[PDB]
C-alpha cells in the first residue's frame, strides 16, 4: 500500500494491495469490478505518460523563449510559418495534420493490437531497468506518482491561463513579485464575489 490516502479511513475491499501506488483511494467505489479496474489501470498510466510529455514540452518552449504553449497554433490559425527551435518548417499545415494523423493511427492501433500490454520492455526497454522484480515495482510506483503529478500540473496550467491569459512563467513571476497581489484570489476570476 502506497499509504492510507486518508488517515483514519478504511480501505476498500476491491483494491488488491501490492500495486504501483495503491493508496486505496476510491471513496466513490468505481473499480469494484475487475475488467473496469484494469481499464482504469491502463488509462491512468498512459494518462500519466502523456501528461508528463505535455509539461516537458510546454515548459521547454516557454523557458526557452519561444512563446508559451498557447502561442504555437497562431502561425497556422492565421497566415504564417511553422517554426521549431528557431528552425522553421517549410511544409503544409494540412500536410503535418494528415502526417501526425496517420502516425498516431499506426501507433495506437499497435497499442490496441495486443490487449493490454502496458510494460512492453525488451526492445521498448533496451536500457533494461526493470530487471529487479522489486525495484521494478519501486520504479512503477514512482512512475505513477510522476504521472498523476504531471496531470495535475497540466490542469493547473489550463486554469491559470484561462483566468489570466498568461504564460505560467508569467504567473509564477507575478506571484514572485507579489504573492498577496498575484494570486487566484487577486485574480478575482476564480471566485465571483471578490
Amino acid at each position: 500500500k502506497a499509504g492510507n490516502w486518508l488517515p483514519g479511513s478504511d480501505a476498500p475491499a476491491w483494491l488488491p494491495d501490492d500495486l504501483p501506488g495503491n493508496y486505496g483511494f476510491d471513496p466513490l467505489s468505481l473499480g469494484k469490478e475487475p475488467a473496469s479496474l484494469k481499464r482504469f489501470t491502463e488509462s491512468e498510466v498512459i494518462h500519466g505518460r502523456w501528461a508528463m510529455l505535455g509539461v516537458a514540452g510546454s515548459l521547454a518552449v516557454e523557458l526557452l523563449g519561444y512563446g508559451n504553449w498557447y502561442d504555437a497554433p497562431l502561425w497556422a490559425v492565421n497566415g504564417g510559418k511553422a517554426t521549431w527551435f528557431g528552425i522553421e518548417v517549410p511544409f503544409d499545415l494540412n500536410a503535418l495534420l494528415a502526417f501526425e494523423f496517420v502516425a498516431m493511427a499506426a501507433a495506437e492501433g499497435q497499442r490496441g493490437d495486443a490487449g493490454g500490454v502496458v510494460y512492453p520492455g525488451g526492445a521498448f526497454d533496451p536500457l533494461g531497468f526493470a530487471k529487479d522484480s522489486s525495484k521494478s515495482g519501486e520504479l512503477k510506483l514512482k512512475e505513477i506518482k510522476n504521472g498523476r503529478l504531471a496531470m495535475v500540473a497540466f490542469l493547473g496550467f489550463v486554469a491559470q491561463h484561462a483566468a489570466t491569459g498568461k504564460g505560467p512563467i508569467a504567473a509564477l513571476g507575478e506571484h514572485l513579485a507579489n504573492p498577496w497581489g498575484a494570486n487566484f484570489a487577486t485574480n478575482g476570476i476564480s471566485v465571483p464575489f471578490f
Partner: protein, 217 residues
Amino acid sequence: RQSWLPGSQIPAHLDTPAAQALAGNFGFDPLGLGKDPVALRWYQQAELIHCRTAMAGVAGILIPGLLTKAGALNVPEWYDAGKVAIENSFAPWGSLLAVQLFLCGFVEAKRWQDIRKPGSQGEPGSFLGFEASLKGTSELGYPGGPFDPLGLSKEADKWADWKLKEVKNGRLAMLAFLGFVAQKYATGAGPVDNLAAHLKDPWHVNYATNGVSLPFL
C-alpha cells in the same frame, strides 16, 4: 437532582448513565431532541465547541473594549474593527479569508475524522511524530498531550470541576454575545455604554423604554 424546573418530570432519554454522566445536566430538553443517543453525543460535542468559541470571542470583545475606556488600548468598536483593520491591513480581504479558510478546514477535517472513528488519527506513519499524542483521551472532545499541556488532567479530583466550569462559562458566553448583538441592533452604541447608561439610571434605561423591544407601547 438539580433540575432546571423543580416539580417537573425528567425527560425519558435525559436520564441515563451517559446523560447524567455527560456534564451540566439538569433534565433540560423539553423538545426531546436527545431521544436518540448518537444525536445526543453529537450535540454534546457541538455544545462543547460552541462554549469554547463563544468564551474566546466574548473575551476578545470585552477586554479591549473595556480598556479602550481606559487611556491606553484605544480600540475602535468591535462591529467596526473589521473596517478599521482592513484599512490598516496589507493583504486583500479575499486572500485573507481564503487562506484562513484553508487552515481552518484542515484542523476541522482532523477533528471530524476523529469524531467519526476515535482511534483514527493514531494511524502509525500517517505523520512522522503526530500519532504518538494524536490519540483521544478516552473522552471525545478532550484531546491530549499538547492539548492540556500543563498536565491539568493528571488530577482527576479536579477533573469534574474543570468540565463543569467550562460548560457553565461557555453557556454564559453564548448568552452574553446574543445580548451584545441584540442591543447593538436596538440602541446601536457601545456595550459598555449601554452598561453605563442602565447604571446611571436603571428605572428608565432598559428595553422597556427603548420603544423597540416592545413596540406596541
